[PDB]
Design a protein around this ligand. Structure first.
Ligand SMILES: *[C@@H]1O[C@H](CO)[C@@H](O[C@@H]2O[C@H](CO)[C@@H](O[C@@H]3O[C@H](CO[C@@H]4O[C@H](CO)[C@@H](O)[C@H](O)[C@@H]4O)[C@@H](O)[C@H](O)[C@@H]3O[C@@H]3O[C@H](CO)[C@@H](O)[C@H](O)[C@@H]3O[C@@H]3O[C@H](CO)[C@@H](O)[C@H](O)[C@@H]3O[C@@H]3O[C@H](CO)[C@@H](O)[C@H](O)[C@@H]3O)[C@H](O)[C@H]2NC(C)=O)[C@H](O)[C@H]1NC(C)=O
Lengths: 54, 57
């Protein structure tokens, strides 16, 4: 998901030229029997148009 | 081709420069002098001589 810094979602207030957003994701790993949490030190986020910006 | 890649950031632009407020108070004071000079100069001479007052119906 991604949203404003506050509770309001993107749909209710579409983004201006500059302000504060956040971004979150979640992972899971299967060892044969159950799904367990997967812990990895590095993952990365990219905000690109045609050329990475962030 | 499959290692880690270095994190980067963005570089904004500087805002336009505002002027310090202890000058603008002086100039709005000067304007407030000049307008009262205008009203005093109208009431001094023969210009604002209220003599055709339209009383009646
Ligand atoms: C009309 O349509 C045109 C075509 O669709 C639009 O043109 C495009 O514009 C964009 C930007 O306006 C151009 O991107 C440029 O590319 C230049 C060129 O570099 C060279 O590129 C060739 C390929 O063309 C490549 O083979 C060479 O090796 C060489 O790199 C580049 O110098 C610019 O900096 C930018 O490139 C990147 O920009 C993005 C973010 O903008 C980053 O992902 C990337 O790292 C890179 O550099 C950044 O520079 C930023 C400021 O310049 C800075 O904020 C970033 O931090 C970043 O890295 C910096 O690097 C400097 C010095 O290296 C350091 O001091 C600093 O600390 C930091 O490390 C694009 O190429 C162009 N396309 C074409 C086809 O020409 C046009 O915009 C549009 N007109 C409009 C919209 O009016």
């Amino acid at each position: 998901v991604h949203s404003h810094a506050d509770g309001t979602s993107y749909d209710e207030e579409p983004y201006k030229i500059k302000d504060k957003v956040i971004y979150s994701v979640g992972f899971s790993e299967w060892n044969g029997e159950e799904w367990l949490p997967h812990i990895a030190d590095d993952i990365q986020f990219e905000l690109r148009q045609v050329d990475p910006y962030y | 081709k499959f290692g880690i890649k270095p994190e980067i950031h963005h570089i904004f632009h500087a805002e336009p420069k505002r002027v310090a407020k202890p000058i603008a108070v002086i100039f709005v004071l000067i304007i407030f002098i000049t307008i009262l000079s205008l009203i005093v100069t109208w009431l001094n001479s023969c210009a604002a001589a209220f003599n055709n007052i339209p009383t009646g119906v």
